C-alpha cells in the first residue's frame, strides 16, 4: 500500500513510529503537513498538489490533525476521501471527536456514562448555572476550540462563581463538572482499533494535585480492565464514528464514566507502557480494511 | 406555536421580522441570545436555562447564527433539537454550509455548477497554484472562518502571485476563483423556503467596480438554487448565482440569509412565508 | 483654540463632554476617529487627510485613545504633535501608561506604593513564583496588552497554581499580586489635571461610587504617579493599605461619567482650561 | 563576564554564534527563553527567577527579541538594566525600532532619507491616499504590530485601490510607499556596532521579481558603501538609540533611502558572505561598553 500521513511534525513519536510501522511491513509511507498542500475541487479530475508535485496512488490517508484553528486540515482529508483514498478515521467522525461541546451532547443522548456537566459562554445567574450541576465541588475547564486549555477544581460555590466570571472576561466557552473524588487523580486511557481495545493503561498525579496527565509529571501502569469498562471504551468509539480513538475513563462508585474520545491518540504514553507495537495493529487495520 | 430566535442582536431587521410575521399569526415570539443560555445535557432531563429561568414549552426554533467563532451557538441549537423543538434548518445542515471550503467541495461532488476554484494555506509553488485553476484573471478571497473578509480581483499571475504570498503572511485559508467577466459585476440571490425559490434579485456593482432590482429567473437558475439547497441539506437558504457563457454558477449557500434586500426589492412577505413553513412542517 | 478629539468612539460621554465644554468656552471643536485619518510622513509638509479633506490650523489634540491593538492611534498623535499641534498628554507618556507591565516598573523603580506584584508567562515552577509574592491570598489578573481582561482572588497556594496553568493554557501575560482585604473591596480614584488633583471619589463593591476627602498622602501619591509616567492628565486608583496608599493603576484617558456624575464638577471644563493656559503661544 | 542572551530558540545560528564567540573569549553565556523568566518587581530586592533558581550575577544582557506579541520579552529587558545588568540595546531603543510606524516618522523628523511614504487603517477616500504618496506605482504593505506580513507592487492607481481595500477588511495598518525602480531589486544590509558600520553586502532578487529577501531564491555579494551610505547608517542607528542595528538601504536617483532597522539583525547573511566574526565584534563592543 502507498499510505498518506497527515502531520504537522514528522519528527514527533507517534508519526515516526506509524512510519516505521508502515515500512516494516513493506507500505510506502510519505508525511504530508496538510497546510502546505493546496488542491483544485472539481467534478471529473480533482486535484491535490503538495511542493510543485500532484499527490497520487494513494491507497489509504492517517488523519494525524492536531488542536489548531484548522478548518484546512480536515478539507485536505475531505480531498482525500472524495478522490476515493481510504481514511483510518472519517473526517466526518473526526469534526464530530475535536467539538467537545458537541461529542458530551452525543455522547450523552446515546446513554454513555458521563460526569454531570454544565455547558456556558455568557451566563447571567452563575448560581443558577452552578445549582444546575448539584453545586461544589465542581471542575472547571475553559474551551479553545478543541483544546480544554485550563482546568480548574472549585472547593465552594464562591470559588466557583469567582473563576467562572474570570474566563467569562476572556470570552472563552466554560464546561462545568461534577467532581468524582474517588478517582483519586487517576484515569484509565483504552485504546480502540476497530471492535477491540488492544491496549489500556493507569493514569496517576502527582502526590499532592488531582491532575492525571502523562505530560504533567504522572505515572503511567498497566491496569486489568472491567468487562464494562471495554464495552464502555468501544460504545464510545462507535457513536462518533471512529476506528481508531483513545477513550479517557474515570472510575466511579457509579460505574464508568467517559471524560474525553480522541479521534488522533499519543502512542508514545500506551507503547512505552504496555510494550505493544500499537503503531503496527493500526497499519494491521488498514491492511484488512482498505479492501 | 411558541417559537425561538437565536440571534445576537434582536435590533437587527431580520430578528425584528421574523418576530412580527410570528406575533402577526397569533404565535408567542421569544428571542435568545446563544451565549447568555447555559445548559445541562442529560439522557433524562436536559435543561436549557436563560437569565436564571428554564427555556420550556418551545414548539420550533429559528436558527440565525452569525459568522463569529461560535461553536457554542450551533451545540445551543443542538439541544433545542434534541429537546424535541422543530428547527427551521438542522444543526447539521447548518455546520455544513458554515464551513465554505466543506460547502464547494460538497456541491462540486454532486456536480452543481461552480466557478472553477482552488484551496490553499502555506503553498510552497504558488506559480502551481496559479496553473491549477487556468490562470488569470483570477479572483482571490481570505477565509476567516465563516467569512470571506477581503476579496481582489487580480488580472495577471504577478498579481495573483503577490497578493496570495500577502495573504499567506497573516496565516488565514486562501480560495483561488476564475474570474467570470461575462456577470458584469452582478449576481442573483434565490431565496428558498421547502422546495420552492419563493423570491429573487440581481444584485450590481458601481458603473466601475466588480443596487437591486427584480429579475425573472431561468428554469436552469431555479433547479440550481433548489438542487443546492438540497446538498447542503436546509429548508430555508439564499443562494448566489453568476450568469455565465457554460449556465449558471452558485458562488454561495448561506443558511441564515439576510431579508432586508429581498424584501425592499420585491416587497414580499418572505418573514410570512418562513412562518408558515415553520406551521405546516411542524 | 481649534481643538482635535482623538476619540475611537464619537458618541461617548466622555467625548461629548469633551466637545460641550470646548464649544461653550467659544473653542472650535473638530471630533477624528484616528482609523479613518490617514497622513504622509515628510520633513517639509507633513500632511494629516481626513474624509478627503486635509486637517489643518489645530492648536491643540486631545488624545482618548482606547486599549485596542491600536499602535496606528499613536501614529496619528505622534504626526500632529510633530506638526506643532500641542498634545494634552505627550505620545511617548501614552506609551509608558498603556503598557502596564512597562508602568508598574516604573513606579516601583521610583519608590511609588505599589501592592507586592510579581509576572509571568510560562513559568515553569509555579509554587516558586508564588513564593516571590509572600504566598496566598494572591490577587490573579490576566493581560491582554493594556486591558486587564480577568480578575481571580485565590484564597490558597492550591488555587493560585491552578488559576496561574489555566491562564497559561491561554498564552497570556500573566499579573500576580498581594491581596489587600484592608481595602474591603474599595478604592480611590484620584483625577489628576497639571500639578493638582481636581477630583477624586470611593468605588465600592456589591457599584456604589461617592463623595470621599483624601488624604494629604493619597493627594502626593496621584501627582508623583501621574508625573513619573509623564501625564498632564491621568487617573489614578488607590488602595487604602495598612502601610499608606498604593497605586492599582494610571489611565491616560480616565472616563468622565464616573467622576462627574458623584462629584458635580466640570471635569471637562477644568480639562479645556488647562488648554487655554499650556497651550502657550 | 557573565553574559545572558535572551533568545526563544538557542539552535538557531544567531544565538549559537552568540555563545561561541563568548566561550572562545572566556565569558559565561547563558541562554534565557524570556516568557519562561518570571519576576518580582520591588525598590529594594527585585527578583528575576527562571526554572526554579534565581538568575543573579550578570555583566550583560543580548536582547535577541522576536516579531511576537511580546511586551513580555521587553518587560524581562526592563527588570535586568533596572537590576544594572548593561543591555546591548535598551528596551528604550528597541520599543522604538519594533513599532514600524513610529521608527519611519522618527526618522523622518531628524531628516533621514526615506521614501515618499503614507499610512492607512481604515481611509475613506483611498484615491486621496494614493495622490498624498505621487500616486502608482506603489509598494503596499500591511503591519502586524512588528511583522510587515505581505508587501504587493501595484503598477496602476486601479490596482492600489483594489489591494488597500482588500487589506482594509482584514482590519490591519496599511503602509503605502513610493516604488523606487532605479534599485532593481537590490538593497544594501548595513551592519552597525558602536560608531562603526562593521559589515555590509547587496541582497539581489530572481530574474523577474523586486523582493531582495535572501529567503526567496535571492543572492547576496560583497559592496563597497559610500561615505554618505555609511554616514545614514550610522545616523538612522543612532535616532533609534540603537548600539547594534541592521538598516536597509536602497540606491536612489535622489541617494540614499532607509527601508528598515532592525534591532537584533540575523548574523547567517552577513557572516557567510563576509567572513567576518560579527558575533566576535558584539561580544568585543559589550567587553568595552560593559
Ligand atoms: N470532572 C472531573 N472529575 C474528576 N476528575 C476530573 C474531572 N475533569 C478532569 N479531571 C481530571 O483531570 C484529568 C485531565 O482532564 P481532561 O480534561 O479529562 O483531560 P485533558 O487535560 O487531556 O484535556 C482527567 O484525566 C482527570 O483525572
Ligand atoms: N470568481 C468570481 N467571478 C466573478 N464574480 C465574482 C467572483 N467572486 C466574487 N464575485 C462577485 O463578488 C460578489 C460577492 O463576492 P464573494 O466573495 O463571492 O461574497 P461576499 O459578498 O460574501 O464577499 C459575487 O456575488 C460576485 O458578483
Ligand atoms: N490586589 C487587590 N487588592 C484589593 N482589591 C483589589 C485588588 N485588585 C483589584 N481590587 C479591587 O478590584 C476593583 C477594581 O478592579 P480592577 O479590574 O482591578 O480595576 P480597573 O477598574 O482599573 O480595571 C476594586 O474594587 C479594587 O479594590
Ligand atoms: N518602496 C520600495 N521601493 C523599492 N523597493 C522596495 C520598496 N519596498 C520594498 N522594496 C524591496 O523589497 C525588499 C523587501 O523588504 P520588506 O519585505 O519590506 O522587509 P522585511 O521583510 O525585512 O520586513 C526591500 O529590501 C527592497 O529591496
Excluded: W
Excluded at 457513536?239 to 480513538?245: H, Q
Aim: aromatic fraction near 4%.
Amino acid at each position: 500500500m502507498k499510505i498518506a500521513v497527515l502531520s504537522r511534525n514528522p519528527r514527533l513519536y507517534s508519526t515516526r513510529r506509524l512510519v516505521e510501522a508502515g515500512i516494516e511491513r513493506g507500505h510506502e509511507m510519505v508525511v504530508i503537513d496538510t497546510l502546505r498542500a493546496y488542491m483544485n475541487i472539481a467534478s471529473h479530475k480533482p486535484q491535490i498538489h503538495y511542493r510543485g508535485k500532484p499527490l497520487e496512488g494513494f491507497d489509504a490517508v492517517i488523519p494525524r490533525i492536531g488542536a489548531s484553528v484548522t478548518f484546512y486540515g480536515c478539507a485536505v482529508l475531505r480531498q482525500f476521501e472524495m478522490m476515493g483514498v481510504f481514511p483510518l478515521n472519517e473526517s466526518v467522525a473526526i469534526a464530530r471527536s475535536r467539538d467537545k461541546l458537541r461529542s458530551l451532547q452525543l455522547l450523552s443522548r446515546r446513554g454513555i456514562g458521563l460526569p454531570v456537566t454544565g455547558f456556558a459562554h455568557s451566563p447571567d445567574d452563575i448560581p443558577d448555572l452552578i445549582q444546575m450541576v448539584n453545586g461544589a465541588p465542581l471542575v472547571i475547564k475553559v474551551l479553545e476550540g478543541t483544546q480544554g486549555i485550563g482546568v480548574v477544581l472549585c472547593e465552594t460555590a464562591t470559588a466557583a462563581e469567582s473563576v467562572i466570571e474570570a474566563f467569562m472576561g476572556l470570552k472563552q466557552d466554560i464546561m462545568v463538572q461534577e467532581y468524582i473524588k474517588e478517582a483519586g487523580g487517576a484515569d484509565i486511557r483504552c485504546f480502540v482499533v476497530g471492535d477491540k481495545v488492544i491496549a489500556s493503561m493507569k493514569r496517576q498525579a502527582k502526590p499532592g494535585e488531582f491532575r492525571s496527565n502523562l505530560h504533567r509529571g504522572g505515572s503511567a501502569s498497566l491496569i486489568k480492565i472491567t468487562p464494562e469498562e471495554r464495552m464502555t471504551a468501544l460504545r464510545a468509539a462507535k457513536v462518533m464514528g471512529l476506528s481508531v480513538a483513545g477513550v479517557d475513563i474515570l472510575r466511579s462508585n457509579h460505574g464508568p464514566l467517559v471524560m474525553e474520545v480522541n479521534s488522533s491518540p499519543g502512542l508514545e504514553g500506551i507503547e512505552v507502557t504496555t510494550s505493544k507495537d500499537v503503531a503496527g495493529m493500526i497499519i494491521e487495520y488498514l491492511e484488512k480494511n482498505s479492501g
